[PDB]
Each structure stands twice: as C-alpha cells, then as structure tokens.
Design an enzyme around this catalytic site. Structure first.
Site, PDB file in Angstrom:
ATOM      1  N   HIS A  47     -32.670 -16.855 -11.769  1.00  0.00           N
ATOM      2  CA  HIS A  47     -32.450 -15.768 -12.740  1.00  0.00           C
ATOM      3  C   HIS A  47     -33.755 -15.277 -13.397  1.00  0.00           C
ATOM      4  O   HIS A  47     -34.879 -15.767 -13.178  1.00  0.00           O
ATOM      5  CB  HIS A  47     -31.450 -16.172 -13.840  1.00  0.00           C
ATOM      6  CG  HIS A  47     -31.897 -17.373 -14.591  1.00  0.00           C
ATOM      7  ND1 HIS A  47     -31.622 -18.669 -14.204  1.00  0.00           N
ATOM      8  CD2 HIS A  47     -32.643 -17.440 -15.738  1.00  0.00           C
ATOM      9  CE1 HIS A  47     -32.159 -19.503 -15.101  1.00  0.00           C
ATOM     10  NE2 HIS A  47     -32.775 -18.766 -16.019  1.00  0.00           N
ATOM     11  N   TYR A  63     -30.371 -13.599 -17.344  1.00  0.00           N
ATOM     12  CA  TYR A  63     -29.553 -12.673 -16.592  1.00  0.00           C
ATOM     13  C   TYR A  63     -29.878 -12.765 -15.078  1.00  0.00           C
ATOM     14  O   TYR A  63     -31.091 -12.749 -14.726  1.00  0.00           O
ATOM     15  CB  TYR A  63     -29.666 -11.145 -16.974  1.00  0.00           C
ATOM     16  CG  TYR A  63     -29.251 -10.935 -18.423  1.00  0.00           C
ATOM     17  CD1 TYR A  63     -27.934 -10.716 -18.783  1.00  0.00           C
ATOM     18  CD2 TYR A  63     -30.189 -11.050 -19.402  1.00  0.00           C
ATOM     19  CE1 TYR A  63     -27.556 -10.670 -20.126  1.00  0.00           C
ATOM     20  CE2 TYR A  63     -29.894 -10.942 -20.765  1.00  0.00           C
ATOM     21  CZ  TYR A  63     -28.556 -10.750 -21.090  1.00  0.00           C
ATOM     22  OH  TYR A  63     -28.260 -10.673 -22.438  1.00  0.00           O
ATOM     23  N   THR A  64     -28.759 -12.761 -14.373  1.00  0.00           N
ATOM     24  CA  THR A  64     -28.739 -12.734 -12.897  1.00  0.00           C
ATOM     25  C   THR A  64     -28.332 -11.309 -12.517  1.00  0.00           C
ATOM     26  O   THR A  64     -27.182 -10.907 -12.752  1.00  0.00           O
ATOM     27  CB  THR A  64     -27.764 -13.749 -12.195  1.00  0.00           C
ATOM     28  OG1 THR A  64     -28.105 -15.032 -12.799  1.00  0.00           O
ATOM     29  CG2 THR A  64     -27.813 -13.741 -10.632  1.00  0.00           C
ATOM     30  N   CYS A 243     -19.271 -26.013 -12.910  1.00  0.00           N
ATOM     31  CA  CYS A 243     -18.109 -26.942 -13.069  1.00  0.00           C
ATOM     32  C   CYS A 243     -16.826 -26.519 -13.756  1.00  0.00           C
ATOM     33  O   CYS A 243     -15.638 -26.675 -13.431  1.00  0.00           O
ATOM     34  CB  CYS A 243     -18.820 -28.075 -13.821  1.00  0.00           C
ATOM     35  SG  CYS A 243     -20.432 -28.104 -13.025  1.00  0.00           S
TER      36      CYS A 243
END
Ligand SMILES: Cc1cc2nc3c(=O)[nH]c(=O)nc-3n(C[C@H](O)[C@H](O)[C@H](O)COP(=O)(O)OP(=O)(O)OC[C@@H]3O[C@@H](n4cnc5c(N)ncnc54)[C@H](O)[C@@H]3O)c2cc1C
Length: 270
Positions: A47, A63-64, A243
């Site tokens: 990211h 942020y990706t 997860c």
C-alpha cells in the site's frame, strides 16, 4: 517505464485530476503521476500512505489503490468511503476521508510508498517478512482465503486482480466479505462480480448484519461455520489474509480460524 514511488522515504505531491461520486457513500479519486507514461510502482500486496496537515495537525493513513501498474499516467485511482461528520456516528467524522472530499481539482496530496510486510510474487509464492527479512510461501501456488470487512476489500481486490490477470496462475481465491448492510458493499459491481469471468479460481461470499428481504448469502458474523464453508480448509495449507473483517484488528488473529485449525503462522492481517 519510470516509477513514481522511486524512494519509499520521499513524499510525492500528486495532483487531483478527477473525482467521481459513485456513491456506495463513496468516491473515486484520480491523481496524475509525474507524466502520461509513468506507473505508480506498487508491488502487489503493498500500500501507500497519504499525509496531510488537517485542522493544523499531521494526519497519515494507508490506502490500496484500485488502479494498477498496468494503468499509465494515473496508476492511481483510490476508492474512498467517506466518514461524514454530523451523522450517526461520532461528531467530527473521519480526518483524511473528509479532507480528500474537500480537495479541489488541481490540489495535490502527498503520496509515500510502497509500504507493507507482504508482497505477492506471482503463481502463488508470497514473500512475507515477520520482524525483518522476507521468507517465501513459495508454495501456496494453489490456495488463499480472504476475510474483508468494509474498506478492507481494497488490499484484497489488488491481489485477486493480480492472480486472475495471469492465465497461468492456478491460485484459487476464496473471499468472505462482511459488511453491516447490503448498502456498504463497496466495489460489488466494480467487478467483484468478476466471479462471473473466473469462478473456477474465484469464490465469492457475502455476509451482512442487516439482511434485506430476499438475501441470497449469509447474515451476522463469523460463528466459525462461515469460515468452514467459505474458505479453503487447513488440510490445504492455504494462506489466510485479513482474518476477521479488517475493522480494528481485534481478537488477535481470528478465534474462528484457530478453531478450524488454521495455523497462526498462515494468517496475515494487512
Ligand atoms: C491497507 C489498508 C488499505 C486501506 N485502503 C483503503 C481504501 O482504499 N479506501 C478507504 O476508504 N479506506 C481504506 N483504508 C481505511 C483507512 O482508515 C483510511 O485512511 C480511511 O480513509 C479512514 O480514515 P479517516 O481519517 O477518514 O477517519 P479517522 O479520522 O481515522 O476516523 C476513524 C473512523 O472512526 C469511525 N468513524 C468516524 N466517523 C464515522 C462515521 N461518520 N461513521 C462511521 N464510523 C465513523 C470509523 O470507524 C472510522 O474508521 C485502508 C486501510 C488499510 C490498513
């Protein structure tokens, strides 16, 4: 082609060239790269950080992007859930989201990158660092479990796209996407239903708190059954990413993942 993120310690002001109101409650921000033939330079799994001075204090958030290193000259498109102030939820809204929403075309914002302990190398080999120095999960080649809640979809979409893009990548992706209502299902169209084009390798399942009248998926949270029917089983030695729903990484990894027997070494939180 020239990389934008040439040094991870340097900060790069990028100009805002476009803003789409999608409206899951969302926006899409398009920023210009140094030029028309530049790419961002963000390895899959990693990211960026945006940092600004907001109401006189420095704020920083990860942020990706949704664009890829295939994109050119803007290779950065970010999809943003905005947390409005004066709503149900707590007074001032969120710092960075609201600021981006305030920007005007031509305003710049500082990008720093790449960041992250996981890097996808292709064909199922994952390069993960623990404390320091990466080790390949060379083999996986075959299978990955993904649990995303709200804005946690982005890091997941990045990897899903990288895999499907490779016709010779046989890694099967299983996504469990949780949200409070059918309404915050971010990127649903925005080819999540890319399941249509690749279901042999892409398995999609949704869960929501508040289910609508003829919901076809699941409702409520995690149980452990949910994990069971929707992610690859331990026996397959898959890798597990985010997860529980990304929300405030609590519980340690998931108590539900342990229950089915997934080793904690194979569970990664972005
Ligand atoms: C790897 C990674 C990738 C991410 N990628 C993205 C991305 O692509 N797009 C994205 O939008 N986010 C993404 N996020 C989320 C990240 O928090 C953002 O910077 C996000 O914009 C949150 O920040 P903020 O400063 O606006 O809110 P803050 O000022 O941090 O406020 C925190 C907020 O508290 C609660 N809150 C505040 N106001 C409200 C409200 N009105 N309603 C409900 N809750 C509220 C919410 O929990 C919210 O997180 C990512 C996070 C990570 C770790």
């Amino acid at each position: 082609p020239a990389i934008t993120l040439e040094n991870p310690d340097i900060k790069y002001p990028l100009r805002l060239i476009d803003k789409e109101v999608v409206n899951h409650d969302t926006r899409r921000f398009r920023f210009a790269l140094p030029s028309p033939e530049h790419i961002l330079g963000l390895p899959v799994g990693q990211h960026i950080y945006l940092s600004a001075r907001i109401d006189g204090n420095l704020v920083i958030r990860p942020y990706t992007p949704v664009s890829s290193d295939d994109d050119k000259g803007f290779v950065d498109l970010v999809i943003k859930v905005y947390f409005k102030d004066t709503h149900p939820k707590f007074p001032a809204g969120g710092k960075m989201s609201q600021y981006l929403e305030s920007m005007k075309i031509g305003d710049t914002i500082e990008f720093r990158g790449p960041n992250g302990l996981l890097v996808y190398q292709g064909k199922g080999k994952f390069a993960i660092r623990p404390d320091k120095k990466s080790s390949p999960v060379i083999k996986t080649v075959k299978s990955v479990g993904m649990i995303a809640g709200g804005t946690g979809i982005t890091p997941m979409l990045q990897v899903i796209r990288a895999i499907m893009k490779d016709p010779d990548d046989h890694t099967v992706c299983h996504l469990l996407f949780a949200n409070q209502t059918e309404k915050d299902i971010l990127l649903r169209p925005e080819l999540e239903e890319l399941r249509n084009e690749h279901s042999a390798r892409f398995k999609l399942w949704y869960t929501v708190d508040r289910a609508p009248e003829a919901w076809d998926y699941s409702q409520g949270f995690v149980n452990e059954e949910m994990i069971r029917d929707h992610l690859p089983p331990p026996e397959e030695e898959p890798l597990v990413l985010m997860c529980g729903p990304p929300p405030m990484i609590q519980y340690a990894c998931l108590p539900n993942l342990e229950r089915v027997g997934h080793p904690k070494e194979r569970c990664f939180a972005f």
